[PDB]
Fold:
Amino acid sequence: GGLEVKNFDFKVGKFLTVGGVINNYAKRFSINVGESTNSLSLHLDHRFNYGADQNTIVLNSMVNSGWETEQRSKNFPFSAGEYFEITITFDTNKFYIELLDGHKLEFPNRYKKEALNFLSLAGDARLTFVKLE
Amino acid sequence: GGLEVKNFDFKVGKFLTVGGVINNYAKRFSINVGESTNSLSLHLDHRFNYGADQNTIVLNSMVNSGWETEQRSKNFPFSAGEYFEITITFDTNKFYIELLDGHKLEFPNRYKKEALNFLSLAGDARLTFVKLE
Ligand SMILES: OC[C@H]1O[C@@H](O[C@H]2[C@H](O)[C@@H](O)[C@H](O)O[C@@H]2CO)[C@H](O)[C@@H](O)[C@H]1O
Ligand SMILES: OC[C@H]1O[C@@H](O[C@H]2[C@H](O)[C@@H](O)[C@H](O)O[C@@H]2CO)[C@H](O)[C@@H](O)[C@H]1O
Structure:
C-alpha cells in the first residue's frame, strides 16, 4: 500500500517538502525517508513530550536490526494542532533539513544513498502533501 | 525511481490533488492513476497539439496492456510554461476530475475499483505536487 508516485525521483539535488497538520494533542511526529519502514536514512522525530525529550528533535537512521546513534536538536518551531512544513535535500555526505521558521539541521548520510524510494509520516500528525522539485 | 508515500491511501472518498509545471512548447502531457504503469483506471491526456487533437483532454483506461475507448473534453484551461493542478475523486461507478477552473469532468470507474496505488505523469510536464485528503 501507500501511493507509488513514479515521477518522484528523490535523488541528490532534489528538494522534498512535506506539509500537514499536527494533531490537537501530540507527543511526537516523525518524517522518515529511506528504503522502507524498517530501513531509513533519516528519521526526523519531533518530540513535544517523549520521555526526557521535551520540545526536542531526535534524528537517527535505522537498519533492519535496529536504530543507530541518535542526534538531538532543541530547535523546535512546532505546536500541537498547527500546520507543519519541512524541506529536505541531501548529498552523498549529508542531509540538509529546513524547518518552517528557517531553522536548519544536518544529519550524516550514513548509508551513502544517492536516491531514496520511501517516505512516511508517523505519530501524532497527518501528512497533507508531498512536493518534490 | 519513484517514491512510495506510505500515508497516502487513495481510496473511495479521498481527494487526490496532483500539481506540476507544463513545459514551454508543450505538445501533450498526461496524468495516470491505476495499479501500475500498464494497468490504469484513468488516463488524462491533455493534448495541446497531438495529431487531430488540439486543446483537448483525452480520457481513457488501460486493461492488460491495451487502451480502451476514449472519451474527450474541450475544457482546456492549460498553458505551456504554467503551473497546473487537478483534483481527482472517485466512487465505485465514476471518477470525478476538477480543474483549477472549477470545470469538472466525469469518467466511468470501468473496473469498479475501491482504491488505487499508482500515480504517474508523462509528456511535456513535470509532476511536482501530490496532495491527498
Ligand atoms: O532513535 C529513534 C527511535 O527512538 C526510540 O526511542 C528511544 C529513545 O530515543 C531513547 O532515548 C531511549 O533510550 O530508547 C528508546 C527506545 O529505543 C523510539 O521508540 C523510536 O520510535 C524511534 O523514534
Ligand atoms: O487512449 C489514450 C492513448 O491514446 C493514444 O493515441 C491514440 C489516439 O488518441 C486515437 O485517436 C488514435 O486513433 O489512436 C492513437 C493510438 O492508440 C496515445 O498514443 C497514447 O499515448 C494514449 O494517450
